[PDB]
Design a protein around this ligand. Structure first.
Ligand SMILES: [Mn+2]
Ligand SMILES: [Mn+2]
Lengths: 197, 70, 121, 732
DNA sequence: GCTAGATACATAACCGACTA
DNA sequence: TAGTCGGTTATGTATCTAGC
């Protein structure tokens, strides 16, 4: 369901995208990988041949799409100047930069971008232990400057989370290992609105 | 009390350094003749490897190679 | 004559690092006679043994050891007309000692025992 | 009692004290003596100097030697023990300071040092001061600020300038000295002074048994063939540094990885095994020379078995020369006419025993020179020292037989007052100047150089010439016609050629707005800050909590190396870092860095790094990525990325912490409660909006009944897990 | 109302254990 | 033997308790 613009017929990666359906269609971005995800292409040798192409493409693309990737192929043996100039242009024109060294990698990038349209971020979160004590001592660590030792101290002192939310600021402060700073942080974390007013 | 580093001038420091070095050059060592060591049977029964470490002899190029290692 | 000697303590040999302080400007070491040498270690007998004690009870317990008596806190001692000042430094070199007159191994303490002496009034 | 100067050292010291310069000694000719002479010269509280490249053992030795000498205001070592707020005081006291390099770069850049009161610097091992080093950075900073103190550089090792990588003029410019002083061993003054205080030396050449000769020849021929093949495959590797007689040495390993590491991205299958085979063959040569026979047999059998399992030593181990090696080893240990054994022992042990017998006979009547005198046997490594002790105590026959049986199938107190023999493991690479230390702790009448190198010969020469009236006898044990001899002679030749080239080079040499970058404090174990500062951008170190480099008021760069990037993506850190950078800074940047001594290559399944990178950049649409081959390119990119934007400032970048407020348009929620909520079980990515919008705070979330939770969440399992988590108890 | 010591942690580079 | 993962190490910096 990728609406490839028909301007890149002579591209040796269209043969490398197989795990996904792609069809031609006259759209301004080079590869339209679903809603709010576009793409462009650039082989560094071609960019060397003409230093005006990619600037014109980026200028005329517009600002419609949320994520506008620009994946490029490296072939030449001296990419440092080209990479520097591309990084500057991408920063100034609000598009990310992706490097691939061979057609298979660029095709794999295409496939991943299409297949991951609503994939959750559960892959990148840290493996969190399911042990009840470990879960509680991990949830109370998210506030700054509070470590596992006083976490367990408060655990033994209070036991349940209910009255931990119920107990007041000074009552929190009385416990050992927890001074004014930790008490303020914990009280404000517990008793602050979720929404910003 | 302020530390002496900021207090004392630099020229006085140089003068102190000169005094220290002029003291250093003067501690001349005593000389005695080394009592002889008994002769070694191993010698009597051509230390060119050690005496070549002075790198001051003739020591032509082929002298830096061993025959069996060809 | 004054030269660096070695003392034995049970299974260990400590290699003392003896130094001699000159007599004013004109230096000489001949006054440190051998008769003035041996009884010296008796003055420092107990200390060495104490040192050879703790080390063992550290080695059996499997952890490093610290000096507790070093250059920052030397041992000033008084004898018969001479001063004594003894430290205990680390060496960091694994020596091995064999007594040739009995060709038997003798362990060396892994600490250098530097003592300095000087004549008095 | 200042240290007396040898006859040839007064001229050297006067030359160096007149003008700044670089002093190059012959190997082993007492560089520590000169360094210590200057240290004792500069121990006053009205002048502070800094010493740069020193190991802890050398520092402690110098400090204690000065203490025994009867000096006041000993030098200090500056480490993590003395914290920043307390460091300034020890800088203003004066005297010699042994500070490390991280501490010094930080203190120079943050101006926590009396940089206008520094009087000079002493550099040890000046051949290590190449551009792109921490010490080069320290020198650059000091000279930029002070421009009045002195810089004196010392070095042994005139060979290290002989390699095609480092240049003497380039280093002399890196050190800001501009004057070269050369003091080789064949210099007229040093040789004249040393030839009057020669030690009595006898050198023994011991001949190896015929089977040892056979094994050595087989090994050498195998190695020669392998080197020929490796050279033939790759025609660039034709420079003379990789000849045969240069490939039997210890320093050969490094040089091979100099030529082959860059080209190891495209290297073949075979030439990844010939290099290994070189490694094992050099190891076999060392093993044959140093240790006994049953160990050699065990090592060969281990090689055979490993090749039987994995097939690793295919390029040899089946030729006729390898079979000669095998039959020779088994003829050295076994004898098959139900078994019988021979167990010969290499001649070095017997020669050492004969030497010890002569020494003992001498000591029996030795009374003329006072007492008996002690013996020091210097070996090559701890294994050889232990082997020598076992041999001497047990004897030859019991030692060999017990080693075979193990490896294969079967008075309370007093003065010693007797001569002692002390075995010392030389370890020539680690710290060459350790023999001298031992030579001072236990003064030997006889020294037995069991395994000899050039530096130790020079050190014994100096130790003898330092005491005019006390003699010593040096035995010099070596194998005739072996690799030991060849390595020694090549070292001699290389040293002589290096010094001649240095002298010729010197002889031909006589004829001729402001922008900043707030940098984290954890980033100074790296080359990037130095490369940034070289261009003309000043650095302001500070302990940031978000990001690494702050190029502008709204740009936060986080630097990640390739291995670091993969690990961070796998762990879970990069997600949190990205969320913080996007929360507090408008234009966050992630900079992925590569290593120049490695290919410029980043090398469906969730395990694939590209998949994680795509997911990360899909979730954070405003994140920007930069790719840079090496820090040299990265610094230039950093300069080009701030061409007109305003500069940043500390004391506000340091103030961007958890308690501060987020961007005006980044999130409609309080970061604290929002982060706390997402961690407790029962709330996922999608449902959190509902519990956040239907409820006010965590306290109200605590008071709700399970029916309303099921209502809002829409899932029964999530609601019940929440209700269990919130209202459970520790004792339950 | 004001100051010294000690616990916990953060972080990047480096070395060893595993392992294929 | 070489790639990869995890532990160790050197410097800094809040933060609390005890003592002033
Ligand atoms: Mn960081
Ligand atoms: Mn980083």
């Amino acid at each position: 369901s990728i609406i490839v613009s028909p301007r890149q017929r002579g591209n040796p990666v269209l043969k490398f995208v197989r795990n996904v359906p792609w069809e031609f269609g006259d759209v301004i971005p080079d590869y339209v990988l679903g809603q709010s995800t576009c793409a462009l292409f650039l082989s560094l040798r071609y960019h060397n041949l003409h230093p005006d192409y990619i600037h014109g493409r980026l200028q005329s693309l517009g600002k419609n799409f949320a994520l506008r990737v620009l994946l490029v192929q490296v072939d030449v043996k001296d990419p440092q100047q080209a990479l520097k100039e591309l990084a500057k242009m991408c920063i100034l024109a609000d598009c990310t930069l992706i490097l691939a060294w061979s057609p298979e990698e660029a095709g794999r990038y295409l496939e991943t971008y299409k297949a991951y349209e609503q994939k959750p971020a559960d892959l990148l979160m840290e493996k969190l232990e399911q042990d009840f004590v470990s879960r509680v001592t991990e949830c109370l660590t998210t506030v700054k400057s509070v470590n596992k030792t006083d976490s367990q101290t408060l655990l033994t002192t209070f036991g349940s989370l209910e009255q931990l939310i119920a107990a007041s600021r000074e009552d929190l402060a009385l416990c050992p290992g927890l001074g004014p700073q930790k008490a303020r942080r914990l009280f404000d974390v517990l008793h602050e609105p979720f929404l910003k007013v | 009390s302020p530390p002496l580093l900021l207090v004392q001038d630099s020229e006085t420091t140089g003068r102190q350094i000169e005094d220290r070095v002029a003291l250093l050059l003067s501690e001349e060592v005593e000389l005695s003749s080394t009592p002889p060591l008994p002769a070694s049977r191993i010698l009597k029964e051509q230390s060119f490897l050690w005496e070549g470490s002075a790198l001051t002899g003739a020591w032509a190029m082929e002298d830096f190679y061993t025959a069996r290692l060809v | 004559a004054s030269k660096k000697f070695a003392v034995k303590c049970g299974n260990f040999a400590v290699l003392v690092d003896l130094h001699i302080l000159p007599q004013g400007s004109n230096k000489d070491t001949s006054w440190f006679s051998e008769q003035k040498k041996e009884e010296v270690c008796l003055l420092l007998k107990e200390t060495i043994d104490s040192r050879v004690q703790e080390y063992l009870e550290v080695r059996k317990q499997h952890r490093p050891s610290n000096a507790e008596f070093t250059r920052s806190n030397p041992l000033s001692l008084k004898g018969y007309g001479f001063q004594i000042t003894a430290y205990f430094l680390k060496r960091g070199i694994r020596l091995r000692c064999i007594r040739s007159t009995q060709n038997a191994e003798l362990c060396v303490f892994p600490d250098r025992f530097v003592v300095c002496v000087s004549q008095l009034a | 009692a200042m240290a007396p100067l040898l006859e040839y050292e007064r001229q050297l010291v006067l030359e160096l004290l007149d003008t700044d310069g670089l002093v190059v000694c012959a190997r082993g000719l007492g560089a520590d003596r000169l360094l210590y002479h200057f240290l004792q010269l500069h121990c006053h509280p009205a002048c502070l100097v800094l010493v740069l490249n020193t190991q802890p053992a050398e520092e402690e030795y110098f400090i204690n030697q000065l203490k025994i000498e009867g000096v006041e205001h000993l030098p200090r070592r500056v480490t993590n023990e003395i914290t920043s707020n307390s460091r300034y005081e020890v800088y203003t006291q004066g005297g010699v300071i042994f500070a490390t390099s991280r501490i010094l770069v930080v203190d120079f850049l943050t101006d926590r040092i009396p940089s206008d009161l520094i009087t000079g610097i002493l550099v040890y091992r000046a051949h290590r001061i190449i551009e792109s080093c921490q010490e080069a950075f320290i020198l650059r900073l000091f000279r930029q600020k002070n421009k009045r103190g002195f810089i004196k550089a010392f070095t042994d090792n005139a060979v290290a300038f002989d390699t095609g990588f480092c240049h003497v003029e380039r280093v002399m410019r890196n050190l800001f000295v501009r004057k070269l002083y050369l003091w080789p061993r064949f210099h007229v003054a040093v040789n004249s002074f040393l030839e009057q205080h020669k030690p009595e030396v006898v050198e023994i050449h011991v001949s190896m048994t015929p089977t040892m000769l056979a094994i050595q020849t087989a090994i050498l021929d195998i190695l020669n063939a392998c080197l020929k093949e490796l050279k033939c495959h790759n025609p660039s590797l034709e420079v003379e540094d990789l000849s045969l007689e240069n490939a039997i040495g210890k320093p050969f390993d490094k040089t091979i990885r100099h030529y082959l590491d860059p080209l190891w991205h495209q290297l073949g299958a075979k030439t990844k095994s010939l290099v290994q085979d070189l490694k094992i063959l050099r190891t076999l040569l060392q093993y044959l020379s140093q240790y006994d026979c049953v160990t050699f047999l065990n090592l060969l059998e281990s090689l055979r078995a490993t090749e039987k399992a994995f097939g690793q030593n295919s390029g040899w181990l089946f030729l006729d020369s390898s079979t000669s090696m095998f039959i020779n080893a088994r003829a050295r240990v076994y004898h098959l006419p139900k078994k019988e054994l021979v167990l010969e022992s290499n001649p070095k042990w017997e020669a050492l025993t004969e030497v010890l017998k002569e020494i003992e006979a001498e000591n029996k009547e030795s009374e003329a020179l006072g007492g008996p005198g002690q013996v020091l046997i210097c070996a090559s490594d701890d294994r050889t020292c232990s082997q020598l002790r076992d041999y001497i105590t047990l004897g030859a026959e019991a030692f060999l037989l017990r080693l075979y049986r193990k490896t294969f199938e079967k008075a309370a107190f007093g003065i010693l007052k007797e001569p002692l023999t002390i075995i010392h493991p030389l370890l020539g690479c680690s710290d060459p100047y350790a023999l001298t230390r031992v030579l001072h702790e236990v003064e030997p009448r006889y020294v037995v150089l069991y395994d000899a190198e050039l530096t130790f010969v020079r050190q014994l020469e100096i130790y003898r010439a330092s005491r005019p009236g006390k003699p010593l006898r040096v035995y010099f044990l070596i194998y005739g016609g072996s690799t030991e001899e060849q390595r020694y002679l090549t070292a001699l030749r290389k040293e002589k050629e290096a010094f001649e080239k240095l002298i010729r080079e010197k002889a031909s040499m006589v004829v001729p707005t402001q922008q900043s970058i707030v940098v984290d404090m954890r980033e100074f174990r790296s080359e990037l800050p130095s490369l940034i500062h070289r261009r003309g951008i000043d650095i302001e170190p500070v302990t940031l909590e978000v990001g690494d480099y702050i190029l502008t008021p709204e740009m936060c760069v986080e630097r990640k190396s390739i291995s670091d990037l993969i690990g961070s993506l796998n762990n879970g850190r990069l997600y949190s870092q990205c969320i913080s950078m996007s929360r507090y800074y408008k234009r966050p940047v992630l900079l992925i860095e590569f290593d120049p001594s490695k290919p410029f290559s980043l090398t469906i399944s969730s395990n694939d790094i590209s998949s994680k990178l795509t997911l990360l950049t899909l979730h954070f649409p405003r994140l920007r990525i930069l790719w840079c081959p090496s820090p040299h390119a990265t610094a230039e990119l950093f300069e080009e990325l701030k061409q007109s934007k305003p500069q940043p400032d500390a004391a506000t970048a340091l103030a961007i912490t958890a308690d501060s407020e987020t961007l005006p348009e980044s999130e409609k929620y309080n970061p604290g409660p929002q982060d706390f909520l997402l961690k407790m079980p029962g709330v996922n990515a999608k449902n959190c909006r509902s519990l956040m919008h239907h409820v006010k705070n965590i306290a109200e979330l605590a008071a709700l009944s399970q029916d309303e939770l099921t209502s809002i969440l829409g899932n029964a399992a999530n609601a019940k897990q929440l209700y269990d988590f919130i209202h459970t108890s520790f004792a339950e």
